[PDB]
Amino acid sequence: NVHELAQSIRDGDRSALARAITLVESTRADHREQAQQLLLDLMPEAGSAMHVGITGVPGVGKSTTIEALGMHLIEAGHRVAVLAVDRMARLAVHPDAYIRPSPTSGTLGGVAKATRETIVLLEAAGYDVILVETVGVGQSEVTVAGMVDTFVFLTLARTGDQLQGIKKGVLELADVIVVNKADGEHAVEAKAAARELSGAIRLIYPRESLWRPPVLTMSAVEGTGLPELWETVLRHREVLEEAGEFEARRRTQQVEWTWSMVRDAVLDRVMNHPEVRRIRDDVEQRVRLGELTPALAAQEILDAAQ
Amino acid sequence: NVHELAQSIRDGDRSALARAITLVESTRADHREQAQQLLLDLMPEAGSAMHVGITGVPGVGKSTTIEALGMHLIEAGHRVAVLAVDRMARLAVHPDAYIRPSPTSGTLGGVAKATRETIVLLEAAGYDVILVETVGVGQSEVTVAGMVDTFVFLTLARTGDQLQGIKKGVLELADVIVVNKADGEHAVEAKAAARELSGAIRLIYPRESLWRPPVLTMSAVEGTGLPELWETVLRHREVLEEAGEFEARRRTQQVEWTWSMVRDAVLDRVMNHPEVRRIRDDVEQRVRLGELTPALAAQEILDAAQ
């Protein structure tokens, strides 16, 4: 069963791949146990692809970029999978590309878990580059950052001195920043904004930094700057491997994800408790109104979940 | 008992204040229950001071700044308390200043809880400005940000084009940024770095923002720029009150702190569990070595805590 399924994936049996993917997406406890045995078997193949995260707000040009980058990597001999943690016509028909929409959300955590595990199945099937994308609602960027080696952030220049749609905790996550839509009359403004952002990075990150994120400009549509974006991603990996830090980071990602599953399980028992859900609104109001102190309110919530 | 103690604090009895402060710092369950009843009684006085956070790395000039700002506010008729969540000779002898070192740490959470509650006792005693400081080890800045209205970040210019000691998730927390030590031969470099940081803020924060953080220069030692730092803090409050957003934010801080106490209690049961503490190292190793998947490792940890 489990071990035969692994070998079929290793052989390139696409049907075994899809079976296994449905197997890791499954909510049943027989499938869950099966999924983990599978992932153990496939441990030698785990890690064998480059992991690249790609984020940006809607309208930045993320689909177009991922499509153009996917084709450019396929032209270079890679096999590319694209996963969403939350269309591309050219890529969906290519035999050496794999495209899965984001899985129905048990939670962000459920989707993430499914994506992480599907990454291993795809590495086993021979995909050597995995692009993981997110639009960045809520905790989404932080989640993708924790499963990739290099996190690429796509932005737009509003003008030559302003960027748009930079969310609260996002630049810090970026290993590469791309000012996209640098074509036509707008090319001018995009390059000046990119330079200005380089200035900000030089100002703020210690000169001593092992890696400081490059700012690049690109036209996803025209394909200019795409080769350079890819060289910068490979450069990042090299600098990290060269520091003996590439594998160290992946091992830390795995441990951190272990603990976040422990945290989600323990916190869910409280947050989804029907009695907590019933009183929580009234508890929060009573804190807002000063009728209850926060410590008393916290004790009331813990009690409700007792 | 409880209600008489409140009135003494309200009257300005310093002995009742210290009693109550030891009462909120106490680990016993009779004192804890007493503390919360006290805080309920004092609910009309809660909130009556300005809450100002002040962070920066060691060597920035934070003690000197807090001392100079404290005196400047006392000269203006305020009564000032300074609390640490983790020396000032002039301030420690003034009758209208209050200085408490950081409380011995049950945890960052314990220290924070104690500081938050002591803020209420101080507001009751007539202190109308509370400065809350931290050096920024670990989760410290985020903790202070969650208990103040305006968070002031102190930095140093390494040169005229580089800042120093900017930690991972900190600029985002700042409502005001100060480039300190802008005196002598170095004044030149400090002002150019401040301008450059203003450029970065204009580049990155939407022009539409209700508040975008000002960058100021200061000499804590000479006292130049201190009045201006204080005007900018008052300006922040005004902009927030004017948007009808000042009280809304405080109410959100209280609710968020309620939940973080619930989270700490629930997570501590697992993390401090002796069986979890016994296996955790070996579990993490087995994940690192690929002998265990993360999901299996998480299940092993949850089981150990069963």
Ligand SMILES: Nc1nc2c(ncn2[C@@H]2O[C@H](COP(=O)(O)OP(=O)(O)O)[C@@H](O)[C@H]2O)c(=O)[nH]1
């Ligand atoms: N001018 C220009 N437009 C682009 C570029 N890339 C994408 N677009 C356009 O921007 C719009 C959104 O593109 P899409 O890839 O769907 O962005 P997404 O929402 O981030 O996925 C589409 O109309 C694209 O044609 C580019 O490099 N230059």
Ligand SMILES: Nc1nc2c(ncn2[C@@H]2O[C@H](COP(=O)(O)OP(=O)(O)O)[C@@H](O)[C@H]2O)c(=O)[nH]1
């Ligand atoms: N040149 C200059 N030195 C300062 C200034 N403020 C503080 N210092 C010096 O910087 C050192 C550290 O000051 P301190 O307030 O203890 O910094 P802290 O570690 O952040 O508390 C001391 O030697 C101060 O005299 C300033 O405005 N200008």
Ligand SMILES: [Cl-]
């Ligand atoms: Cl509690």
Ligand SMILES: [Cl-]
């Ligand atoms: Cl689990």
